[PDB]
Amino acid sequence: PVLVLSQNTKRESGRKVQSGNINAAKTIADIIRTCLGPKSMMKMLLDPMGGIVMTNDGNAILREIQVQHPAAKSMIEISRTQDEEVGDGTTSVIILAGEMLSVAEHFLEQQMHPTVVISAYRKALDDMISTLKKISIPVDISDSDMMLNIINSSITTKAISRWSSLACNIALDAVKMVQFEENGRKEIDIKKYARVEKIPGGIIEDSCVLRGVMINKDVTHPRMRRYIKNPRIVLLDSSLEYKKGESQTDIEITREEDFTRILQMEEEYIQQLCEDIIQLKPDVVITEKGISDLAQHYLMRANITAIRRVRKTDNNRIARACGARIVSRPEELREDDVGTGAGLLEIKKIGDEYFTFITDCKDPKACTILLRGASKEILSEVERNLQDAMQVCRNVLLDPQLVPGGGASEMAVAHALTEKSKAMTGVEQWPYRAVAQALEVIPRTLIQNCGASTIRLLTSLRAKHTQENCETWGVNGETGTLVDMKELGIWEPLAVKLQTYKTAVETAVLLLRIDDIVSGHKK
Amino acid sequence: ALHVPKAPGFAQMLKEGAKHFSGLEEAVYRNIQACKELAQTTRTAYGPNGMNKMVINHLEKLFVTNDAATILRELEVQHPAAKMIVMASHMQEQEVGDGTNFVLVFAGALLELAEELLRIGLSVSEVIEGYEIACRKAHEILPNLVCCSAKNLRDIDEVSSLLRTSIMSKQYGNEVFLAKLIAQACVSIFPDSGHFNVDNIRVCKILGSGISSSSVLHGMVFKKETEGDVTSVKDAKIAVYSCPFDGMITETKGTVLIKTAEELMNFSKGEENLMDAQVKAIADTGANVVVTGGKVADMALHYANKYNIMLVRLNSKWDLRRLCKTVGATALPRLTPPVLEEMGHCDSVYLSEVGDTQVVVFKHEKEDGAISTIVLRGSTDNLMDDIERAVDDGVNTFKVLTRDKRLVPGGGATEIELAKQITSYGETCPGLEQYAIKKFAEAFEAIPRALAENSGVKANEVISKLYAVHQEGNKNVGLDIEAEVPAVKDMLEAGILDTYLGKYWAIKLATNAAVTVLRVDQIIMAKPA
Amino acid sequence: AAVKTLNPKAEVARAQAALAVNISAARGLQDVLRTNLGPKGTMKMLVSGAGDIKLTKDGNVLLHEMQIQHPTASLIAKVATAQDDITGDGTTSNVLIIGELLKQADLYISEGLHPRIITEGFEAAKEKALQFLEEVKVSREMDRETLIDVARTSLRTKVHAELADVLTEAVVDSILAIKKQDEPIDLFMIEIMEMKHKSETDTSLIRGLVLDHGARHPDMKKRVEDAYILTCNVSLEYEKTEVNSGFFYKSAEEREKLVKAERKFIEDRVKKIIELKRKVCGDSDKGFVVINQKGIDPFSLDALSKEGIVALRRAKRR
Amino acid sequence: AAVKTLNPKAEVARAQAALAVNISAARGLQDVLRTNLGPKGTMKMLVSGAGDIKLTKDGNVLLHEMQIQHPTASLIAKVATAQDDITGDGTTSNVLIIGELLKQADLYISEGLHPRIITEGFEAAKEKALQFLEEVKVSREMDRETLIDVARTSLRTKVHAELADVLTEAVVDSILAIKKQDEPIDLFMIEIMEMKHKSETDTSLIRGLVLDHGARHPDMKKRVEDAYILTCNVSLEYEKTEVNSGFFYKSAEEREKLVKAERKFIEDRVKKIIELKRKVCGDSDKGFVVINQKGIDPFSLDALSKEGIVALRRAKRRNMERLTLACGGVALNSFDDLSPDCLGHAGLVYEYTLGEEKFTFIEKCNNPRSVTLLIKGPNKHTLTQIKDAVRDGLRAVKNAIDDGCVVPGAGAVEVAMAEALIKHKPSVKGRAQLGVQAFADALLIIPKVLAQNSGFDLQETLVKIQAEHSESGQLVGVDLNTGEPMVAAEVGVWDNYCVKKQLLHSCTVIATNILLVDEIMRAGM
Numbered sequence A: 001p002v003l004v005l006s007q008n009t010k011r012e013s014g015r016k017v018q019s020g021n022i023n024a025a026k027t028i029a030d031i032i033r034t035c036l037g038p039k040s041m042m043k044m045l046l047d048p049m050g051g052i053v054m055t056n057d058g059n060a061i062l063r064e065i066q067v068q069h070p071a072a073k074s075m076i077e078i079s080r081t082q083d084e085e086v087g088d089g090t091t092s093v094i095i096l097a098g099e100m101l102s103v104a105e106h107f108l109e110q111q112m113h114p115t116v117v118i119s120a121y122r123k124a125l126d127d128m129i130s131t132l133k134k135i136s137i138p139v140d141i142s143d144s145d146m147m148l149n150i151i152n153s154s155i156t157t158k159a160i161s162r163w164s165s166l167a168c169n170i171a172l173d174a175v176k177m178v179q180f181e182e183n184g185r186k187e188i189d190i191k192k193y194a195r196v197e198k199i200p201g202g203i204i205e206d207s208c209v210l211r212g213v214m215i216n217k218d219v220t221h222p223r224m225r226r227y228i229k230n231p232r233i234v235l236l237d238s239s240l241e242y243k244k245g246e247s248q249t250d251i252e253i254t255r256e257e258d259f260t261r262i263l264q265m266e267e268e269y270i271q272q273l274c275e276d277i278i279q280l281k282p283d284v285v286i287t288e289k290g291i292s293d294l295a296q297h298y299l300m301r302a303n304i305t306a307i308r309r310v311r312k313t314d315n316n317r318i319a320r321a322c323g324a325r326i327v328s329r330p331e332e333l334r335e336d337d338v339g340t341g342a343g344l345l346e347i348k349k350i351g352d353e354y355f356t357f358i359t360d361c362k363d364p365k366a367c368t369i370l371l372r373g374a375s376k377e378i379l380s381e382v383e384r385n386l387q388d389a390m391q392v393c394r395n396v397l398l399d400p401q402l403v404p405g406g407g408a409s410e411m412a413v414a415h416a417l418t419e420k421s422k423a424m425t426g427v428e429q430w431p432y433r434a435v436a437q438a439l440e441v442i443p444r445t446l447i448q449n450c451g452a453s454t455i456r457l458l459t460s461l462r463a464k465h466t467q468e469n470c471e472t473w474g475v476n477g478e479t480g481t482l483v484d485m486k487e488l489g490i491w492e493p494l495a496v497k498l499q500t501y502k503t504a505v506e507t508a509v510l511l512l513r514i515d516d517i518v519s520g521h522k523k
Numbered sequence B: 001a002l003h004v005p006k007a008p009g010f011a012q013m014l015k016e017g018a019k020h021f022s023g024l025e026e027a028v029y030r031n032i033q034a035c036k037e038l039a040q041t042t043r044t045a046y047g048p049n050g051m052n053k054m055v056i057n058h059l060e061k062l063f064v065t066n067d068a069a070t071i072l073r074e075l076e077v078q079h080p081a082a083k084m085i086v087m088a089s090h091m092q093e094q095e096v097g098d099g100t101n102f103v104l105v106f107a108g109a110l111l112e113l114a115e116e117l118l119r120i121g122l123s124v125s126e127v128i129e130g131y132e133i134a135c136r137k138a139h140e141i142l143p144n145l146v147c148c149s150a151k152n153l154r155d156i157d158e159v160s161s162l163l164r165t166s167i168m169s170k171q172y173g174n175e176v177f178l179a180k181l182i183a184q185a186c187v188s189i190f191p192d193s194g195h196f197n198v199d200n201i202r203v204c205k206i207l208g209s210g211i212s213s214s215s216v217l218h219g220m221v222f223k224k225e226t227e228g229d230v231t232s233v234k235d236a237k238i239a240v241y242s243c244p245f246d247g248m249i250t251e252t253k254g255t256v257l258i259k260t261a262e263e264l265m266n267f268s269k270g271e272e273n274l275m276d277a278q279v280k281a282i283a284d285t286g287a288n289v290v291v292t293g294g295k296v297a298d299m300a301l302h303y304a305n306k307y308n309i310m311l312v313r314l315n316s317k318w319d320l321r322r323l324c325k326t327v328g329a330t331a332l333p334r335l336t337p338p339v340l341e342e343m344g345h346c347d348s349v350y351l352s353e354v355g356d357t358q359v360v361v362f363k364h365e366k367e368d369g370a371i372s373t374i375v376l377r378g379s380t381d382n383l384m385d386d387i388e389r390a391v392d393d394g395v396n397t398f399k400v401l402t403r404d405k406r407l408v409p410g411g412g413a414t415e416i417e418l419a420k421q422i423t424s425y426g427e428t429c430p431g432l433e434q435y436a437i438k439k440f441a442e443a444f445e446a447i448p449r450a451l452a453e454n455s456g457v458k459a460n461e462v463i464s465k466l467y468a469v470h471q472e473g474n475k476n477v478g479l480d481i482e483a484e485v486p487a488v489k490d491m492l493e494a495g496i497l498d499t500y501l502g503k504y505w506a507i508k509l510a511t512n513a514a515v516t517v518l519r520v521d522q523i524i525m526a527k528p529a
Numbered sequence C: 001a002a003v004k005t006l007n008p009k010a011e012v013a014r015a016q017a018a019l020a021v022n023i024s025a026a027r028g029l030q031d032v033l034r035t036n037l038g039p040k041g042t043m044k045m046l047v048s049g050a051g052d053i054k055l056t057k058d059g060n061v062l063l064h065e066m067q068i069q070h071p072t073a074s075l076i077a078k079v080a081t082a083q084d085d086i087t088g089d090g091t092t093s094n095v096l097i098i099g100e101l102l103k104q105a106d107l108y109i110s111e112g113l114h115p116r117i118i119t120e121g122f123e124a125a126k127e128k129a130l131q132f133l134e135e136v137k138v139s140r141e142m143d144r145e146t147l148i149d150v151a152r153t154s155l156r157t158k159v160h161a162e163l164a165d166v167l168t169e170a171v172v173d174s175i176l177a178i179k180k181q182d183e184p185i186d187l188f189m190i191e192i193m194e195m196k197h198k199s200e201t202d203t204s205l206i207r208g209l210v211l212d213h214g215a216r217h218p219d220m221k222k223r224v225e226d227a228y229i230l231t232c233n234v235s236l237e238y239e240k241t242e243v244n245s246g247f248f249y250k251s252a253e254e255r256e257k258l259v260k261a262e263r264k265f266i267e268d269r270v271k272k273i274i275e276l277k278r279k280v281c282g283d284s285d286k287g288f289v290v291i292n293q294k295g296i297d298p299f300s301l302d303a304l305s306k307e308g309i310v311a312l313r314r315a316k317r318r
Numbered sequence D: 001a002a003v004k005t006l007n008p009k010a011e012v013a014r015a016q017a018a019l020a021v022n023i024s025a026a027r028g029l030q031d032v033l034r035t036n037l038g039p040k041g042t043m044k045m046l047v048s049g050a051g052d053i054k055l056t057k058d059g060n061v062l063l064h065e066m067q068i069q070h071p072t073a074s075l076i077a078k079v080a081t082a083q084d085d086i087t088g089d090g091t092t093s094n095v096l097i098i099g100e101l102l103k104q105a106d107l108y109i110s111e112g113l114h115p116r117i118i119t120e121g122f123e124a125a126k127e128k129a130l131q132f133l134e135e136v137k138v139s140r141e142m143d144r145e146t147l148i149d150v151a152r153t154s155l156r157t158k159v160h161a162e163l164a165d166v167l168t169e170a171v172v173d174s175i176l177a178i179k180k181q182d183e184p185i186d187l188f189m190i191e192i193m194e195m196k197h198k199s200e201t202d203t204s205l206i207r208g209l210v211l212d213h214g215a216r217h218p219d220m221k222k223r224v225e226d227a228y229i230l231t232c233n234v235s236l237e238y239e240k241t242e243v244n245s246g247f248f249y250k251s252a253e254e255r256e257k258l259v260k261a262e263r264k265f266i267e268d269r270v271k272k273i274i275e276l277k278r279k280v281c282g283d284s285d286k287g288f289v290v291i292n293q294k295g296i297d298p299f300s301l302d303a304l305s306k307e308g309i310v311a312l313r314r315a316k317r318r319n320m321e322r323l324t325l326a327c328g329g330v331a332l333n334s335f336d337d338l339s340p341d342c343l344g345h346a347g348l349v350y351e352y353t354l355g356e357e358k359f360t361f362i363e364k365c366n367n368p369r370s371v372t373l374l375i376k377g378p379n380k381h382t383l384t385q386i387k388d389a390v391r392d393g394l395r396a397v398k399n400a401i402d403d404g405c406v407v408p409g410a411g412a413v414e415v416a417m418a419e420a421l422i423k424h425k426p427s428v429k430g431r432a433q434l435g436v437q438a439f440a441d442a443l444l445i446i447p448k449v450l451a452q453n454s455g456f457d458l459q460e461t462l463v464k465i466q467a468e469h470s471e472s473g474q475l476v477g478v479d480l481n482t483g484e485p486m487v488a489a490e491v492g493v494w495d496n497y498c499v500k501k502q503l504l505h506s507c508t509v510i511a512t513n514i515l516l517v518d519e520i521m522r523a524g525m
């Protein structure tokens, strides 16, 4: 056999490849098309680990499904991108990208070149950005009511919508506490310092955000207190045990007293560490590494409560919450490194497990959202929805501009692009106007998932958006009627919708540039 | 939790390998996608610039053609909706003989636009209503788009100009020659009565020389040789027998019962004397040519040679019947000499060698008769089969013109005028039917679009030019294939014309096929046996 | 269980199992056939294992064509088949009402009510419903208009509305033509011939007959105006003797005489036909068409063509 | 379909198919667990793949032990597991109410009603039912008699009646012993030890501790009367140095000196213990028992036996706290400065051998805030069953103390809540009244199944009970011996307010989410 490329190297090319990519993308779109809006339905995904994921989140769904077509791979990747960047719009992006590729299929069948289509798409994207920024409105982020409405307009499309007020307040409190500035750098890190702990049982209405943190831990010794009302807290990265040296420290004994002297020396070392700790007069000591029983003895003699092996992330949150500074050498321990600011340390039994609360903090720059509910799956969905809520709150606090929902923004932008296209005289006017009408898919899908007549409602809406001050008009995903968003209250973050449009248009551009698939070749 | 079970009911009771599709997504859209793929497989063969395809069937037989119905037949279409569109195309081939690719293109276009309308929010019922009302409007319109009529089908130049268009899409390079040949044949076999039979046009494909060496023959040709010593005859007095050229025997078992040496000695001489008497009676009726549908016996052949009769053996019964029609004879089931009326005549009957092939020719000299043959020369059997298909297209066009003499402009002119008028009708029709009417109109654009794409030019500019000219008022304007750039010209003045009946039936059948595919909502395929 | 201790490879569904199985299958069939009901129902496409296509809205056809292997489904398919054999309509409604009776009975059986008590209630309700049906039925003079309304109510469920408006008049006129007052209607006397060339709205009623065959002799006329029709069941081809016979001759001349003689028997029947034809048609003004349930050999076909008779052979016993 | 065009080996259940799948699995679980409900329920036997036997009437155990591979079943098993982790009771009722909500909702969804509308009705009915529950709950002074009625109501469902009459007093006394006024009850302070020798009615409450090990030196006493208990977490065996050391000697005499010296470190702790013992017990009148969370080598065991100390080694990290709460000493990780105040007292300490195992009883403590329930029984499965039952009973009494309220049982609260929901229905807007009706008819599955298991006609019994509750307004339930209505509060059939609230909440939530599932999908391949 005289081949040039290895067998298993299969090469497709041309309009078959183009149509295949577009069909794979629009299939990814049809998978989650119904998961958009307030009247969506849940999907039960089965993990390879025997798990279950009951969700409405586009990125959760697409991340749990597996594909082999590279266009579908790219669509799943852009859903991941939207989730990582803004944490919302994970299904709006998929649907818009699918519709853009769908409308590009026309021009590709009609002998237009993909580069022409792409240049038109990029023109349209810039003009979309312009139109969104013109129709956006500002926000007074000090207005907790405005912020709660922003968060409700984002979680109404999720399961927690029944506990909307609770979840909104939880997310707002968590983000406002995680807001932190040091050396002129503002930081809302709701991934390291807003923690969600799901404890099955109880009821969701008792879920709360703590003014402090919570870990699943107990005292090292039951003689230690489990309730302290003004704890001075010390955090350590070092083991309070006697460990070996880094070198070959081998000893050689010939005298009798030397063995006992060595063991007593170990004990004295632990005593000296514990005294270096006691000198700061703490109430609680929390370690990422072990704590020997002799160290426990000395701390208890000092009336200190110890928690043995905490995670680095939990320790960092305890630091931010109680105002402490993690240390690694109790000899280097300072009052500035001691943690004052926690208002109560409690260690209580939730079910048959012991949980440590460091709550009642003042100015805690970290938090723990304690979720309670029927099951790990329900609580996983509540946690994902709360991630959405907190990420939306964060996007707003960073860029306080808002845009109207219910497809109002899509219709306003489509109208503006159609109006700008009348000055266009080249051949790109057609793909340009096509992406403009391809933005209409969001209200179309909303109407479909509400169960109303897309033709009639979308026609009335496209007509409403030809009037002057009607860029706020959209549709209810709950009744199937056109309303003013100024009256309904569904306002999305400009950052979210910008990222959505950009990701959609660029995904379309990528899949349009793609041709001539090749496969088989092994790295 | 690692397996989704089949839902209770039909999903569990379904057989092992059976499939069930339901709803717009699993059934309607998948059917539309299949029909679209089919239309795409045959789109590049539409029109004079249409390209040929080399289809190899399961029997490893090779077909080189741009005839849509032939391509479909030789393809293994397995999707049922595509099968339905192919059934429509074959019904078009049966009813008209030309327009199958129109049927495919138009049906695929209607279905693609129907999918788009269902996505925008129309119901299959509304789409079907609009498609039906728009097909009715198209049928109401087409009679007004008729531009010319034949005005004479006994001529040979007018008939050639009329058949040229149908035989141009197939065999674009050489169409004046083929239209001349097919016109000569059609008007030879055209009787004083308005009835025209296409089976009376015979086609003999002989290897050798090329398409320009093809010819028409007022008579018949058989790739046979003569059984006896005579090979030529100049004033044929043909006698035709459906029986063998042997002594008649009993249908009940016959036995020669000998009981005496005299009977034994005389039986065989009596048999030959009987044969001599039979053949001499035949020869004395004046017959110089005998054509038997059965076998020939050695003694009968001996005596036919003795009495100078040309013997011909035609195995086929259709061949025997057509020879009888040709020469004006009657096939006799007995070896009795023919009466003055049962006999046939030909200005010549001879054995010739066309190429390597030996043929027996019953040739009239007069420019008329009941049957005519077209002897197709060519360097390849595949080429000759494609030219035979083109001949079939020309002959079926002649028959369509005998039925209805009306003609519409080609090159997309009628399609563009239809699209325009039906769009103007949908703009007046209120209600959700207007969307479907307008899409039915836009579907017609698929024809000039396919012509332009195959011509090698931009279909959007071609279609814009056509719309502009038909708005200014010229309904006979269509695209010019003899132009590297997008162009348009008067289809009538150019002589590019289609058959009113062809368009009528193509539109009707394509609309019916699309509407049936849409009317399907659930599919329950069985396990492929 | 008990049966499985004696026949180890035995399948068994018990009282709660048996009921669940049967009701589940009934509801599955009901879920499939629910969409057939009414003129707004949807047409299903059915593809055989060979690839043949069926477009149907008919409950019985759909049942027999679906790919199902369930015992309850077999029971219900057979009851529907009886419905179709006796009435021609009611198969979809049959399946739907069966499924709904089973479901509504399960509603009470799941709460511990006994199926015997449910079936007693079924018997009471059947009695009262038959009474009410006889009461509400409209006894009407069966005029063409009423029959048209009936045939429309059926054909509009089975096909498209315009094709239904054609088939309605076709069916009503056919029945009103083959029906004799107070004489059960023999639907066998309405032939049903299919032609595969034109549009579906060309379906018509021929006030006569259409045979799916024609003359096999070319010289026979293709059109006859005032025709005498001879309906026969007489062989006009060569018939061999029941007892084995055979021909014995000593000369080619004797062989020729026997060849001419062996056909005299059928030639005589051909002559009888020809003499009747000559006596009834003294000229070529009228026509004569022989329609034979049996064969006609080429010699007889020639003999009849020569006399101007159009002979069709191997017609149908109906 | 769409997912199957991208992942060909993908399994998918669509809008009609996913609802059918989920509801079918829920009803299957309900059909299995219907028989567990009530004291007249039936015990199921469960055989592992190894051949181990489990006798259970408990919904959670039955769920986790059945051989099931269904996604909906996994969802419901997890909700039941949460019910069990937080309340200890309500798993069977949880599964039953889930199944009945799904069935009653399918009743309206099969006729084309949307699951969204059913779930809206579910939310309205949940609100009204929680209100009615808080209204009917009985806030009662938690006396021993009330706690006994509660523990009886649980143990009589889980085990036989005579064994329940034993476990009732055992559980109630244990909790009333380890409970400090207005201090959450730490059930860890009730040890649970199983012995496999005697009858199941010998299960008792030891007002002290029972360790599953004893002394490893034979010369150590097997019974000590007035004992000083030393709870320690100090190694009394040979400890090697952290840093690698090694011994180097030039003579057998030096080797002998090093052998004597290498143990001085632990000998010193042994001497500290022995000196404390001598100072607190100047004679052999009292006793001294060392209980070490860590090891004790044979040399130390000999040294302590010679001085008359009973040393147990490798006790449990929980027994450290349990011993300091029962006896009353201090648990030590070091003998630096040990004093007689670090010791506890037990009025009796002795040893019990059972075949190859040994037990150590520590009893006659003064006021032990930690106790043990000794589960005696003839079979491993009997012991496991009683362990499960006492878990349920302990949780029940603990919950009755936590929630100073207690709710009537026998389907009384469900009957009354159904009537209240049906009277509330008109105030609900739209076709969510049907979701309300479905919620009510689902609540009615508890009395229905109780009747079904006592051997009565569900409809007749329920009509009688509902009639009595409408005529009188008294909270009436099923009498499992006559099928008649009875006042559960008067006959002492009590349920946990926490359990009922958790049922309402979690069942409503999981049923809503299941009804709103429209696609089941396995596409991880």
Ligand SMILES: Nc1ncnc2c1ncn2[C@@H]1O[C@H](COP(=O)(O)OP(=O)(O)O)[C@@H](O)[C@H]1O
Binding pocket: A035, A036, A037, A038, A040, A058, A088, A089, A090, A091, A092, A093, A153, A154, A156, A157, A404, A405, A406, A407, A442, A446, A475, A476, A477, A478, A490, A492
């Ligand atoms: N009450 C409502 N009525 C109409 N549209 C809404 C409503 N609430 C949210 N939306 C719209 O639904 C979309 C968000 O749907 P969602 O399921 O959250 O998808 P994603 O966040 O992945 O884009 C946005 O277009 C938002 O404006």
Ligand SMILES: Nc1ncnc2c1ncn2[C@@H]1O[C@H](COP(=O)(O)OP(=O)(O)O)[C@@H](O)[C@H]1O
Binding pocket: B045, B046, B047, B048, B050, B066, B068, B098, B099, B100, B101, B102, B103, B165, B166, B168, B169, B170, B409, B410, B411, B412, B447, B451, B479, B480, B481, B496, B497, B498
């Ligand atoms: N010279 C020509 N210029 C433009 N169009 C032509 C010419 N000859 C034929 N056509 C067009 O080609 C089409 C038919 O091509 P063909 O491939 O045979 O399709 P069909 O199978 O439908 O007849 C018609 O629209 C006819 O008008």
Ligand SMILES: Nc1ncnc2c1ncn2[C@@H]1O[C@H](COP(=O)(O)OP(=O)(O)O)[C@@H](O)[C@H]1O
Binding pocket: C036, C037, C038, C039, C059, C089, C090, C091, C092, C093, C094, C153, C154, C156, C157, C158
């Ligand atoms: N035009 C109509 N309007 C309302 N109902 C109709 C109409 N035509 C038929 N029906 C009813 O629809 C039902 C079902 O029709 P079909 O499915 O053909 O009957 P079957 O159940 O006997 O197969 C019949 O009961 C018939 O009365």
Ligand SMILES: Nc1ncnc2c1ncn2[C@@H]1O[C@H](COP(=O)(O)OP(=O)(O)O)[C@@H](O)[C@H]1O
Binding pocket: D036, D037, D038, D039, D059, D089, D090, D091, D092, D093, D094, D153, D154, D156, D157, D158, D408, D409, D410, D411, D446, D450, D478, D479, D480, D493, D494, D495
């Ligand atoms: N003696 C009794 N008489 C009537 N009902 C009882 C009695 N004891 C318990 N019940 C009721 O039986 C129901 C089911 O008991 P069980 O199955 O143990 O509870 P769960 O459903 O929490 O597992 C409870 O609601 C309880 O109120």
Ligand SMILES: [Mg+2]
Binding pocket: A088, A089, A154, A157, A388
């Ligand atoms: Mg969202």
Ligand SMILES: [Mg+2]
Binding pocket: B098, B099, B166, B169, B170, B393
């Ligand atoms: Mg053609």
Ligand SMILES: [Mg+2]
Binding pocket: C089, C090, C154, C157
């Ligand atoms: Mg009917």
Ligand SMILES: [Mg+2]
Binding pocket: D089, D090, D154, D157, D392
């Ligand atoms: Mg219980």
